Amino acid sequence: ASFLNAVVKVYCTHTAPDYSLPWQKQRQFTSTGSAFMIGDGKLLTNAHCVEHDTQVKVKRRGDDRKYVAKVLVRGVDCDIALLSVESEDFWKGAEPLRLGHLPRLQDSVTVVGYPLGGDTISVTKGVVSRIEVTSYAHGSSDLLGIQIDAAINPGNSGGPAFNDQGECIGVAFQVYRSEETENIGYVIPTTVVSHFLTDYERNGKYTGFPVLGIEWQKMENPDLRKSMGMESHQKGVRIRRIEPTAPESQVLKPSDIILSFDGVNIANDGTVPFRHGERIGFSYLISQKYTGDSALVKVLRNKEILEFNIKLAIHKRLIPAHISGKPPSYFIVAGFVFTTVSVPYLRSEYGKEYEFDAPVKLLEKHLHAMAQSVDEQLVVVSQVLVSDINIGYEEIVNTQVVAFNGKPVKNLKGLAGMVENCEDEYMKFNLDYDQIVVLDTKTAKEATLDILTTHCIPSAMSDDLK
Amino acid sequence: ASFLNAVVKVYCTHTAPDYSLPWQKQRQFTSTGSAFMIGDGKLLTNAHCVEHDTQVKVKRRGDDRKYVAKVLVRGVDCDIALLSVESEDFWKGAEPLRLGHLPRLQDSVTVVGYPLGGDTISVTKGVVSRIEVTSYAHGSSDLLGIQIDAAINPGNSGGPAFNDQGECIGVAFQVYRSEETENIGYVIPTTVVSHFLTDYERNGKYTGFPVLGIEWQKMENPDLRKSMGMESHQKGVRIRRIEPTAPESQVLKPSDIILSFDGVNIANDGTVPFRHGERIGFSYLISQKYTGDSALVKVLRNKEILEFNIKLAIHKRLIPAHISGKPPSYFIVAGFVFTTVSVPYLRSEYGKEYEFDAPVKLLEKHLHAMAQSVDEQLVVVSQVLVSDINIGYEEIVNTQVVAFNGKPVKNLKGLAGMVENCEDEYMKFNLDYDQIVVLDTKTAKEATLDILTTHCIPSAMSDDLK
Amino acid sequence: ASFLNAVVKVYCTHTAPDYSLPWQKQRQFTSTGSAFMIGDGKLLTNAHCVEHDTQVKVKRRGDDRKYVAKVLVRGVDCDIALLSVESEDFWKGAEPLRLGHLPRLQDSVTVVGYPLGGDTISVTKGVVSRIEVTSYAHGSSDLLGIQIDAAINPGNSGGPAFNDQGECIGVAFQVYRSEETENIGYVIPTTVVSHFLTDYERNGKYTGFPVLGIEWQKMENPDLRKSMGMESHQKGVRIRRIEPTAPESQVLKPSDIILSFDGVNIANDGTVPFRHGERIGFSYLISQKYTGDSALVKVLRNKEILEFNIKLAIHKRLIPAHISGKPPSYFIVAGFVFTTVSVPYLRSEYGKEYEFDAPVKLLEKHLHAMAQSVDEQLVVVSQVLVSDINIGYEEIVNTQVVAFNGKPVKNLKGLAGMVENCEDEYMKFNLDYDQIVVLDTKTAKEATLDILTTHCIPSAMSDDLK
Amino acid sequence: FLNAVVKVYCTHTAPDYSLPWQKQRQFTSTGSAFMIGDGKLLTNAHCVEHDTQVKVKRRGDDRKYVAKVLVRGVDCDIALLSVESEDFWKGAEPLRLGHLPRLQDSVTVVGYPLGGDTISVTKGVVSRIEVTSYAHGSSDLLGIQIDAAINPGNSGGPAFNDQGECIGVAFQVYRSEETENIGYVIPTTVVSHFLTDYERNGKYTGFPVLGIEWQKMENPDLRKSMGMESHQKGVRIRRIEPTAPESQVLKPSDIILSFDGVNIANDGTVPFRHGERIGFSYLISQKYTGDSALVKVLRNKEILEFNIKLAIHKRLIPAHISGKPPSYFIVAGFVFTTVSVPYLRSEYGKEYEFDAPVKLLEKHLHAMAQSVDEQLVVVSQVLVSDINIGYEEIVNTQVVAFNGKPVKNLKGLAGMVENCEDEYMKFNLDYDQIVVLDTKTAKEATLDILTTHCIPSAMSDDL
């Protein structure tokens, strides 16, 4: 029962930026979660437990005090964060958990944490149900995951799952809930946790989980395989498209057939052998490597077998699934609020149903567009703060800015600089839907200050543009 | 862990007949389920996993290929089907499961299959909760069932439940889900599975589970018992009504009191002793027998004790709960679409709420009418394909046809023959609600072909009427 | 498996009083639950299983008969009732359960009873999840509770939870259900059960669970503590308010800081040490005592440490959460229906959402008002049975009566006596919202009988006012 | 008067767009129609869409007489009916059409709405007159809003002025929890355009609308920057339909100053009547297809004039499929069809504009046809078979090329697969996917698949 004492309750006050009004914050709100001692003065929890934190406190069993904690480091896409606690009273007699190996299906598992239904610690018990590449909902990434049938409830997030030997086999973090389903809950495996910790130890920071920038197609059809010159004994997946900002774009080509990755053969359905008689998606081979590592990729190209050693990097979306450790960027000229499109921005503008209610143009780029350069951003006029200077333009909302005075717009900083250094008589913004916005350059800039005052906006731009 | 490899994933493409437009099919749709090796080149799954199959494929652990399978035999009311697989690659190294005995309450149980929440195999664990006669939802019959508290999810259908010795104690098949309930899931017991397999082995086909064609009333009231001449030491159930198409109608009478079945005494509440200190509904004694078997029934009739040996048969509903291995029958004359009323037909015409939205006349027969002869059917005008020939009759929908030219209508084939061989000047259909439909016989038949063309109907009738 | 036979099925027909029309009953309705043998011809079940009983029957395993039972005694706030059964046939071969000690977290637990999904006994299994002071929903009180992750379903109420040694560790009684949660179910601990049984044995009746009549405030802020003269080493909770009808009101004062209870130190968050390294709310120390016991309370008052021995009593709400073993009181004069405000009354008048739809005046007293004297009641005009005698007063509903002919109204009996002995020409009722109702005393009383006849009301008042 | 207004009974049998080889279930509706002379009844096109039978009943006669649809204009929501029986026409007196009314003119609506079986009259005033979206037709034409109650069943009946002349056809409403008495009437000007068109050409030739997208020029800096004088006004051309004649002479960022000598304001409006303005589309709509118009534009300080021939608007993704069943063809279980609004609605429900694939909606809202008769071709679904193993999950995905050749429309694709001599059929699909089939074995596999799904033919007759 000594294992329970390593598990602490997390109290978090969150203050999120208003993506729709990026100069200000949303209303404070509180949540609770769990965390556990992993050694060397560190607690592990889920990143989603402490997102946009303005205060984090922890409470250990047997002690009534809630101690101030700080977020040491976070990994948004693997949904892990480490906490530090200054108070030496908190750490007295601490006994950290040890991490165990990946479990086998049907292994007994217990989940320990602070879910709804009470204030004190709670234990639930079940078995390991399923292990495969899993969609991390909050992290928006695909990593190894352990499904279990021990009940996971709100508040369990960040607490450990234990094997019957008292070793931590991972972190309870998410559930699949519907009116049709029962006891489908997920755990971040120790292999993923170890990856994160090793990463942080080596680099003094989080460097992510690599994922090769390719889209692919299964090759289950025999005519398809034959037509591309595959022999009866060959299997693999066809490259659809390659991220321009990935180093494999310099050596791989569309319609290449990927035969293997680090000498492991990829099946026509994109799976590779996994442990004891199972098959798993090939992405697992990539995500277990570190950014900066290299991997040997074998392809078939015009019936010729080619091998390339490719450096692995994180995935950069044109429309980021998250914007962490920074307020959303914006700048304002003549009442026009320019900002960038991110998933949180879309969710703010169009609610939880943003995937169906957002403008099709924006959604099209969210699901299908690849960044053509690093640091490329989708820039839009968010809204127009209505004044006399912007007459006739008042109804413009969430429309992409494609060019400024003939020059293509690559990102927000690029655009902000262009309006800054503009000496022409007119500022000409080419917008989506073949629209043009034109302002007299001199009177445009003069009009900004009064508009900010009206809307109680303390600054014309985010600090990163100052 | 070798037991897992006997459990395969089922992929099914279903194409259901349109009961509302019986000349055509509904749109293709796919589902997935589970199945397992039981020996001799056979897989067992649920019948509901492969209903209206146009293609079935299976996938074994460790192999990426999906192999074509065929439905060998199905038992609709016990919800079991057997599959065959031609590919010898699929069967290589196969190790079939062995069936265990009926378990006891609190026995550990594990469920293995392919539920939602992932693509690979999943295991859940719990205990045997309850064993009694259970309503098989898809099969619409009452057979022994095992309730368990191991989580069963969509996709688990057709997979095995195991005892702690690795024997299969049955097939995971259905759940009781409401906002109020948790972990109420059911398993088809090995006794039912064995009945099905023995049946198929003996007869080369499925012959069903017998159920005596009697409705009965409990005799819990002492005045009731006394008034019917029961002695203080006698107990049993009163016969309300007997199916005319059952052989016990020739020897049993309404108001008989059934005292015993195969020497087993029936209590006033219709229960008999079951295993260790429990009581179960008497139907269990009947359903464990095979169709064609005989049973000794003892009754009290006017204070006289009588015994009859009665041959057991399946139950035939006037309005069938299922129509399997055949398209729904129909024929058309002069735009009138004649078909028969089945549960799938009612569900098609009036949705999932057919029990409350269907015409009361039709519902009355669904819940309460007994077939007066074998092969009797409830025939209706489904709809009228509007043309000049059927002027004034256009609004007729789902109305029973009771007679044709003075002769009673017994079933669809009977009616189809009567319109065929009709040489009278007029065809006179007596319909429900005391209506009469009259058509000139000659011009009625001539008008059919054009109407079929308009509605793109390839044939005037189903093949079974050709 | 012999333990199962001590667990019986409960069938209850309830007939509840109509709180909105207190002269009559609501419609009969039935429920089912569970109960178990605890020795000496007694069965234990939940009080909520037999609330407003007009008939209770039980059925033991293996026997088809349902035997008439009677409620021996009930404890509404701990949700326990004991049943007796006259029939000696029921008790033949009975083997009662033994009560075990409070379990530890992660201890295996099995729940046995008669939930939905079948008619026979069902077992579910899980672990002890959490132990702390718990809100008893039906009982509306705060007592020790055991949370478990074995599934509890409707019908389980009143059945035992067992440890792995076959001892009863408590009574399955309630769940926390939401679309977000799974397997949060609660058990009345053996310590609470033992309290109830000991209580009934000693006193021949139920005397409740004491709870000191104080409201308190946490003292987590250091400036707060310092400002009230607490030393750095002192901790406790501040008294906000004291129930006038509690004997600690004679010795404790608002703004006192409670330092300890029976020598157990109370933390700034109101918790005390509990078992192995845990902390629990201090109310647990009080509720484990019996009414009539005394407790030593130490307080800080103006930097002086004072100790008082205080007699403990049950909590009496102005607006009772329950009214048990008696029809709701009422009396009628001139069509005016006078009654008292209780939680069931509010629920009847304003449905399940009574906490948000009831008049704010009434709700204000429900959440915040303390009784100023014992037997004080909130009296209202429920409604006005419209006649000529009460012209102009017809729209009065649920309005508090504060005085009668200048005299304050303390409760319903007090008011009933005052209208009875009124010899003045007028009866003057002062109502809430500064309204006055005046009737001619003589013609008011004469008018009652006809009004009762119109509404088929057999009597002008409840028997307790006769 | 009342006896010229008749009740319409229609049995509809719509094609199943999701399963284009067959029809949906019969359903019935009722509406209204009126005698306009020469053995003709006028009603709404939506009253008789996909008709398998139409009957009419005149007031005081119990018989329901068979009618036939002579001609329909889907986008203006008008249809004409004929009735063979002489008994139906006994003592008939057709209605006369009146001139466009003015705001506040009294109006009566006559027809056969819900709430009873016989004729019903409602009364109100003319509320508002402006270019209006015809919901069923999906075009923008002049509409009269009125405050006389219009209910289901009124469709196709006349609205009358107080002189008993028909001022239009009651056809649609704006209903929400928030609104009351917002009903619309197809004006006599639109009706006359339809009747004149049908009389001239023996068929419906539509309402012209020029293929230009434009931007308002309300901003002074915008106007000044493009070299507009302080007195000049107009609209800026955003984009021009490649399949429109004006794509040859007009250019993006031209500023349209006038149409037929009529000056266009910065908000795209022109003088209308009685002190009101109206969208310039009205000037175009009142002309006939084949007519020309004089367009004056400003381009690089220079004022240019062009005589532009006018035509109907043709969307890449059509709002309606009329005069034919939806086109399709099948090879090896692959069902190919075209994307239309009715297809999207059938596939994704009434909320298709939010639930359909973002790729498809993108083209629905924003894409212009690049060539005449261009269509968006998709694989609708794959009828599962051995021949199409691995491709079963393909749904609603655009076909962009066949054996290296661009797919223009369904007929084009059908002809390419028909005449394919190559060993393989290689389809480039959206999302950078490729589907490949052996040419010989794919074609052989078709017939048996049809049999399984009870499909009478591999392709629609138009292919």
Side-chain angles (χ1 to χ4, degrees), chain A residues 443-464:
Chain A
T443 51
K445 303 189 174 177
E446 297 174 357
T448 311
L449 192 60
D450 292 328
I451 296 176
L452 306 183
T453 302
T454 303
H455 297 268
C456 301
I457 303 176
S459 184
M461 70 184 68
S462 50
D463 301 293
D464 63 342

Side-chain angles (χ1 to χ4, degrees), chain D residues 87-98:
Chain D
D87 290 329
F88 167 84
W89 295 105
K90 181 173 182 172
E93 289 214 90
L95 303 178
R96 292 160 60 251
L97 300 179

Side-chain angles (χ1 to χ4, degrees), chain D residues 298-353 355-361 363-372:
Chain D
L298 176 67
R299 178 192 301 175
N300 288 117
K301 307 292 193 61
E302 291 185 343
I303 289 185
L304 310 179
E305 278 192 3
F306 299 98
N307 203 23
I308 300 175
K309 196 178 181 68
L310 302 174
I312 61 172
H313 177 51
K314 225 55 182 175
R315 302 179 181 90
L316 176 58
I317 295 183
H320 50 83
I321 300 180
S322 188
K324 71 158 97 298
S327 304
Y328 76 94
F329 82 93
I330 302 178
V331 49
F334 281 84
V335 182
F336 298 92
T337 194
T338 63
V339 182
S340 64
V341 175
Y343 181 80
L344 295 171
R345 181 177 298 116
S346 176
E347 286 287 298
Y348 303 103
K350 54 175 300 184
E351 309 300 327
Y352 65 91
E353 233 147 6
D355 293 327
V358 184
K359 284 274 196 171
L360 292 184
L361 297 172
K363 295 182 172 56
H364 166 53
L365 296 173
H366 306 127
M368 286 179 172
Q370 295 303 309
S371 65
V372 57

Side-chain angles (χ1 to χ4, degrees), chain A residues 100 102-179 181-200 202-230 232-249 251-275 277-306:
Chain A
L102 194 67
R104 295 191 63 171
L105 302 199
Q106 207 174 334
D107 279 359
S108 181
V109 57
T110 56
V111 168
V112 180
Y114 300 84
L116 272 34
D119 291 329
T120 60
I121 206 166
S122 182
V123 183
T124 55
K125 185 171 192 285
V127 297
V128 175
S129 288
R130 156 195 276 152
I131 298 170
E132 63 187 71
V133 177
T134 301
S135 173
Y136 282 41
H138 205 264
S140 190
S141 64
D142 294 324
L143 301 167
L144 193 67
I146 300 164
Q147 184 183 313
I148 70 180
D149 78 352
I152 296 168
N153 283 289
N156 275 118
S157 289
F162 289 98
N163 61 24
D164 269 12
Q165 287 75 46
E167 302 175 317
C168 174
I169 58 163
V171 190
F173 86 115
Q174 69 176 31
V175 296
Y176 186 118
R177 295 270 145 98
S178 63
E179 12 197 5
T181 51
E182 280 192 345
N183 302 143
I184 302 179
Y186 303 90
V187 165
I188 306 176
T190 48
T191 52
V192 173
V193 171
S194 291
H195 186 291
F196 179 80
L197 296 175
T198 299
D199 183 21
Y200 181 57
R202 288 185 188 166
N203 302 289
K205 62 179 177 179
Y206 173 67
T207 61
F209 288 77
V211 31
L212 36 61
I214 73 117
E215 289 181 337
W216 51 273
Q217 178 183 345
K218 295 180 173 176
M219 297 286 289
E220 295 168 307
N221 187 269
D223 293 335
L224 178 54
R225 296 198 302 278
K226 211 157 305 174
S227 72
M228 294 179 78
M230 295 177 75
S232 179
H233 68 277
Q234 287 168 326
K235 68 191 184 180
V237 298
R238 179 197 160 255
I239 299 183
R240 294 194 279 142
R241 194 194 191 193
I242 305 171
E243 298 277 352
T245 66
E248 56 262 34
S249 60
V251 297
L252 264 41
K253 279 175 165 47
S255 287
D256 278 359
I257 296 155
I258 303 170
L259 298 171
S260 69
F261 180 94
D262 283 335
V264 178
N265 285 336
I266 301 171
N268 290 327
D269 72 343
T271 60
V272 296
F274 183 59
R275 308 180 90 199
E278 189 53 270
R279 299 195 67 86
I280 196 179
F282 76 86
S283 73
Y284 170 67
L285 298 176
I286 302 142
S287 58
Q288 66 181 11
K289 296 211 147 178
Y290 298 83
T291 61
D293 290 352
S294 286
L296 186 61
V297 182
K298 183 200 302 284
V299 300
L300 187 69
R301 181 182 301 170
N302 278 87
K303 303 200 198 74
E304 181 179 11
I305 294 181
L306 304 169

